[PDB]
Design a protein around this ligand. Sequence first.
Ligand SMILES: C#CCn1nc(NC(=O)C(CCC)CCC)c2cccc(OC(F)F)c21
Lengths: 359, 359, 359, 359, 143, 143, 143, 143
Amino acid sequence: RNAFYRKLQNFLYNVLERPRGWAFIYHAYVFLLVFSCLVLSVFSTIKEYEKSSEGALYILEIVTIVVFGVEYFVRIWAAGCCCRYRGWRGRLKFARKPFCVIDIMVLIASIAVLAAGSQGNVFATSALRSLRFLQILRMIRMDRRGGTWKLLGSVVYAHSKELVTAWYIGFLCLILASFLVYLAEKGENDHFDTYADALWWGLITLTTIGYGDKYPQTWNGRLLAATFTLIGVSFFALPAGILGSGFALKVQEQHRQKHFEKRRNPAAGLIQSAWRFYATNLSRTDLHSTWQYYERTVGLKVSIRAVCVMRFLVSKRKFKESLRPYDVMDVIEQYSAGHLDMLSRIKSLQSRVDQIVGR
Amino acid sequence: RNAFYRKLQNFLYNVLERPRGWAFIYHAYVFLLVFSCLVLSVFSTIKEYEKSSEGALYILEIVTIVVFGVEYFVRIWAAGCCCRYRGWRGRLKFARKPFCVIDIMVLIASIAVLAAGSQGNVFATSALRSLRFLQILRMIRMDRRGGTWKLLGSVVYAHSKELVTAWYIGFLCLILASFLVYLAEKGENDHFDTYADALWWGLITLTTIGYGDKYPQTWNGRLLAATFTLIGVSFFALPAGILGSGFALKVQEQHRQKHFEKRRNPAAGLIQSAWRFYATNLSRTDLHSTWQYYERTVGLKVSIRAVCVMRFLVSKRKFKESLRPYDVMDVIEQYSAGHLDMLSRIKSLQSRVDQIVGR
Amino acid sequence: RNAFYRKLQNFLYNVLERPRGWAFIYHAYVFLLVFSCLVLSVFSTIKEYEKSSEGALYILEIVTIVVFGVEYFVRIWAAGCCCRYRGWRGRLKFARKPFCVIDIMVLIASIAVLAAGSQGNVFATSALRSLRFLQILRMIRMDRRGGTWKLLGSVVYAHSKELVTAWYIGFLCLILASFLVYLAEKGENDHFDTYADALWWGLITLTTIGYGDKYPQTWNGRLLAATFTLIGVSFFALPAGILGSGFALKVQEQHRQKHFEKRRNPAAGLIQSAWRFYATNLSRTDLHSTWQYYERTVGLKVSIRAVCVMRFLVSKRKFKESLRPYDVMDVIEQYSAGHLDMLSRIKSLQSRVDQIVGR
Amino acid sequence: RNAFYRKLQNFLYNVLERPRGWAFIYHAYVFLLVFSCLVLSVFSTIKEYEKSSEGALYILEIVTIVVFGVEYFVRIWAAGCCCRYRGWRGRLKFARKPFCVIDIMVLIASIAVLAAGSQGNVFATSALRSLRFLQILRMIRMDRRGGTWKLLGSVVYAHSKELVTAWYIGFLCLILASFLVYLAEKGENDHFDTYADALWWGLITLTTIGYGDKYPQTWNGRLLAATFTLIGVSFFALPAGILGSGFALKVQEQHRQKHFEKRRNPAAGLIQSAWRFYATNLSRTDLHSTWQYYERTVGLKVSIRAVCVMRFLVSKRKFKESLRPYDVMDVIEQYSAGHLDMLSRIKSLQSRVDQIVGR
Amino acid sequence: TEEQIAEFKEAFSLFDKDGDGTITTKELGTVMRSLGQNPTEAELQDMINEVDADGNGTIDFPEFLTMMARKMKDTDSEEEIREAFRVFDKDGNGYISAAELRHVMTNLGEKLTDEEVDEMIREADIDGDGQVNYEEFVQMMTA
Amino acid sequence: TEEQIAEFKEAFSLFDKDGDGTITTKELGTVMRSLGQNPTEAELQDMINEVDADGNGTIDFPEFLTMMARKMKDTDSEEEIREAFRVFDKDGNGYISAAELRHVMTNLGEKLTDEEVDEMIREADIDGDGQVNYEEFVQMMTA
Amino acid sequence: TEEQIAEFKEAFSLFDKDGDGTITTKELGTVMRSLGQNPTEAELQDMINEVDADGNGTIDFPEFLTMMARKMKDTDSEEEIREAFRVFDKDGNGYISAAELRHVMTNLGEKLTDEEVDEMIREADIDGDGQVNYEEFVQMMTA
Amino acid sequence: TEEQIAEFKEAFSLFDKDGDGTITTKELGTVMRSLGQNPTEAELQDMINEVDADGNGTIDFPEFLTMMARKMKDTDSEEEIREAFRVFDKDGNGYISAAELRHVMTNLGEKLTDEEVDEMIREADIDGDGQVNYEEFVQMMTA
Ligand SMILES: C#CCn1nc(NC(=O)C(CCC)CCC)c2cccc(OC(F)F)c21
């Protein structure tokens, strides 16, 4: 069943590499399993629940090594589906991907720690640390693309000036308020023994964590703390609000722009122009016969080649400016072109009717 | 008074099912009553205020069973107003609605617990649990449509990628900061006895709850806690800001789009086309006489039917693309069509004036 | 100096009633003074700082009664400037304004409490409560228009559905998490003695206040608290973010719309139409001579009156739809009208050129 | 190497004064160094880590004085590159800049405190305070332009009304809730001894700091605290959300507007008009020969001068309205002009075709 | 009075061209084109909407008479005119310089002649100072 | 039945002008211009799209017949017609006054004559009260 | 000087066509059409606005003379010209290559001839290096 | 080779009309109008921009020859063609059905004939299955 085999392999590749829709379910399950393991590892640290947590953790470690090995082999097969990695050499080339090699390294580490535990020589602390680190490593691997980091960095850089303003003003407010409260309390309050303690109090207050170990206990200390916290809490909360609003606005703008679509025209122009520019052959029976057709519509050889490259070049630029269309640029440029065109045609109407009057 | 009876029944149905405006007041009152009951139930748990709270709770339980029964009967009558549930069978069909059956089940449970309390055999704990659960059930019933859940899910899915980025980065920051502070403190601080305690501290800090039971007490622990919290608090606060900004932007976009309106044209076209397509009868005295009129304006039978269905089909599509008009799609498509039309007519002007010059 | 007196009176009226710009400075000072008094009143409650705070409070009370009396008299004079309150009867009419009568009542109460303190019979508690309440009353009076309340209510109603979703989901999460943690801890933890205590803990946690008196101390309690808080904190923080984003979007939309301006055309039309409709007199030497002029441009009397009222009526509607212009409505309607007009004129071009060909 | 020297001097000036891109790296490093020093200063306050922190602080102080001196001299050289400060007098004029004089004062203070420490007479407290204040002074100097303060003030003023609404409503809620909880608890709870304590509790609660020293312990106190905090926390969190959303919206609007660009046309017109208006000379061999050319295209002298100034004036205005183009103003005005122009030309078409019919 | 009804009928017939008992958009357009000002079809349709209550697309005699019986005092017209004046009130106190009206009121929208604006001044400006107070003037018109 | 197929072929030939076995946009345009209503090329292209499944740019006999075999009951047309009626349902209960249809249904979009709207009324309004209930009417049409 | 006033009056009469003592939009339009460049009515209205202070819709002799008495030094023109130069300053230091002006200054807006731009260069570029420094040049023009 | 340079000069003269040693926008427009396709001035200006490096507004012989010496392999053209193919890759694996190209590649933009698209198929589709793999094809063209 060649068709069935290809269809199944493509389906598995889509699920394991490009989970557009319901495929995410599977990934979630895997994450859950991994996450569950992590939680068990935490329970393994506690000495009270050592036995049951250790047993469940070993069972889940066996299950997860099995699942990860099966997934890795199936992912090798799926990458085999992709033309970029067709054949044994292509699959090996795919397996050199940094995330794939990281995953296989984690798998080998897990099987190795299990085997060492079977041996018994390996200390329990070593195995626990190893398994915890492998679990977090697969957690990181879940991204597999760096999409979250890239998005966060993009939004942070977009609001770099505003974030820096928030950080700078909040830092100045923290320093000033901590110093003033330190002066107010100093010896009166045991909490504010040293300026380092005052800075710790200020950081824990303006962030609104408010542990309660440190807090002013004098009338002037409390007065200054009130006046300064009323603004410092907002300053320290600013970055979260700025980033959240930026994320929401970016989501809105994307849901508009990527929902525009209506593209691939410059890409089609590129395909045509590359085809014609490759066709500029040495008078062989290939498309250069179509080039003789093209020149028929009209030494001359060079001009033909020239024009082909020209379309190629121009097409390139179009796609380059059409890769990420901007609504404001599109609308402004189209309005300018259209209105200028209509005005020019109207003036042509005036000239033509004037000559008609002359006629 | 047929007119008066119909008007009153419609008014009650609107109040109890489609509370557009002032009708909400009534619902609020009901909620308040239910909410009040809930609060009393809480006071019933405390052993100090058992007597007074129990007496007031019994009085309010009688009042609320009475009110809910009256409301249920009046709601059955109101649904009777609706044509979909006209007649005894229609009203019974209405009563099968999941929320209606849930409400009647809650009513029976409340009357049953009251009767059991009258009997005295039922234990007080059973009655208290029953009444608390029925109260929360009616609280959930207040929605009656799942609107809140649907809206929250829609906004969450819209920002699924941003929310996942926030969760992932915050989780990584929590794990890293908790582990580093655990290493810094470990044995020096009694609070951070085990890594589970460190994780609890990290969760309570980055969320800014800051209970105060756990907090670093070492110079390196406090330094790392400061550096990591300064960013972790923002990361954990991100989701609230993202969701709030998304909600506000959605409200703005809705207050624009639903404020557009200017629709029902495709719906009217659909009505006309369905009427004409039904009219394609077997040469009877019905609209098919109007079909003879339509064909008069021009074997042929099929074409008539064809064209009728055709309008139907196109009408359908129009309404489908006019159900939820998008400002950007509307504006872009209308601009393209209008400018292209004007340009084509201008070129027609050029051709016609050229031939006039020829004439 | 009639001109100087009128100019000064207008300047004081603008400062005291319509503080557009730098005038706000003065108001701020007054607020500061009032606020200072309030703070002193707080220090008066403390028994340790009774003497100095009482002395400063009495001095500031004398100062503030003097300032408020001077301001009230000058405000009477300023309202006298306004034509609406010209003359003694006009000033008395202005003085019936609820905020003015509230201010004079507060002034009388302050002078009365000062006189009673001079007498000595009045108990200190009575005077302290009186002065605190008068201070808060003037603080409320600072608004003088209800602008803050109106703006907050407008933004809240705009996002009524989203806010209700946030409240409902957060309430359900609070109830569920509190009950689950109560079950987990119950007797193990002294904090969660009763479900009321669990509800208090849940409210103080999800709001992120985190006092620290209540907190889970069991493995299952802490696990459930983590899972539920991770979402409850965001749900409870939602309303602040929603309102803030709504306020920012409203500010943006206002800074666009009110910055449009370009109006008063329908208002001018209203002025003209009202002038002409009043002019429809009983054939007297007033504008009805201009009505004879108007009818000259053409029993007939009624038509004249008709048309005048007609302009009036239409003018009204225009101003009514031009009071709060909407950018989207303006742009969409102007685009529709303009493109339809151009298309119709283009078809007129086609018809005229066709007949020219015929000619 | 004149070219090499000029290029290097310009590169250093750009890095030290206009760090557009990668140059920021250097600044960051400097900040880090300064920041590191600050942290060491904090460790110097603690008596336990006095020795090591003092040694590292002295080493870093020597390093930072060296770096700041080198940077100041190189910045003098760089400002020398700028034409505004060419020559010795120009460099001296640049050195009078307030930030430059502040920096040199800080440098002198640092070298002076180091020399005094070498002498040993200066008390350790004096040196520590001096170095801490100099460190914060350079931290402030990092801005060098007041950009953060200006941006924050702009956004705050933009949302002045909304922020004032938030502050006012939150203040009223704080006062009311604190007073009600004070009445509820008063003598029952030791925490709420006096109304000042109640106000402190209310401030620490509504801000969500929640130290835990103060918290209600009575049924009515807790009930009122719940009802009032549920709204007060949101009111106090509002300003952060409002400012964050405003910052994000401002970033979006800027990333649109400043990304428009397509300007310098009015600036070019201004340059031309200034050139021509200067050219209106006393009939000398300068551009006034070009003025004879200009008048050739046509006592008359004045008109020439008139028209030149006129372009100047009009050019000025254009640039003034083109300095900060607004998308809404640009689009609305261009639409009005274009549509009115097309309509007028269409009516010209109607008139011309009518006369052609007459012809 | 019967004389008013006779005037109403006479002018309604005058506006009527075909004689259908109702005034159409074209009738108003042509009669006010004879009046010198050429309208737009939107304005005529607006009149048709404002007079007619049954949506007949024209102006019938009953609605004509009912609109005739409605004088300014019975129009609830105070708020609209007050707001229109206020939008033109730069100072906001309520006084407007007659020169301001002459510059603007006769330069915007339905521009009026010098006689009409000066009559406005002498009507509203009872004091004859130039500081016209719109509130009292409009209130006494609506009396 | 064979008679239906003969009718189909006869009218398909009638629409056909050049005789290529398919109906193009121009054929539909001209035939329905003879019908009195002049379309727009967008409408004809929409018909070409909705009939044709192979994207030939015209209407062929097989797709014509397949569309013919699809009656209203086999169209999944209940939701669209119900929604269209609902958008016109001001009260939202499901009853619409026949006068409302006469005022609107014959005044918007493809306006219909008095006979057609009255036939709609007597069809849907079985009770003959004027409170037409669209749900039952559309359901029984789709039967 | 009286000679300057005589020149002013002579040219004001020259611009004047009907002889009303004021220069209208059409007068400026026709005189500068004779000058070769055809304006737009917006530009002529802009001149009417910027000269006239009483809003007469034209240019009168007193405002003409007052604008004449205002030389560059008494115009507060430093900021505008500095900003205009800065917007064209790519490097931002204050030096612009004369080749840059030749490429741009004569290719945008009111494009000037080679003679005018070269005279600009030899005027501002005292050093004769091509790195024109706009600040000193504009300051000395405004002197 | 000298033959290539002779060809270059011969065709450059052919395009040249006035004989100024450079090819202007009008020359390209007229020569490719003879070619059957009528351009827009924007396209000719785009060509002028892409060839010319000194901004002369035309195409000179040196830039012509330099552009001639640049073959596909020395164009850094892999990314653009790969991205263009990817945007058309619905599945995203890298395989496209030749029928998909025939339906789309010859129906959008610069539509090509059946011969050209079939030659594309037989060129890229070495396996002759219809699942053209654009990556290898474009890479080997760029070889
Ligand atoms: C979610 C959540 C927490 N939250 N937040 C609230 N805040 C507001 O409503 C407005 C007050 C004005 C109506 C805040 C804006 C000023 C609120 C009110 C009632 C109950 C709540 O919890 C319950 F629903 F779980 C509330």
